Amino acid sequence: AQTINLQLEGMDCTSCASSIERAIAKVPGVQSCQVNFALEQAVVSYHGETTPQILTDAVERAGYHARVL
């Protein structure tokens, strides 16, 4: 697995934290996604064709914003 951290914007509540996990989990190649609500960060484990930029697009499409750390 490869791993990447994303900084998250718009995650004001734990419902939205779950929304972000669900959106990231749908990305082909994602194996696991740990959303840290307190730290406004997601740790994503992946393989396959996943890229950091496909991950931040998933977050955008779900109605939030991410940036690659």
Ligand SMILES: [Zn+2]
């Ligand atoms: Zn919310």
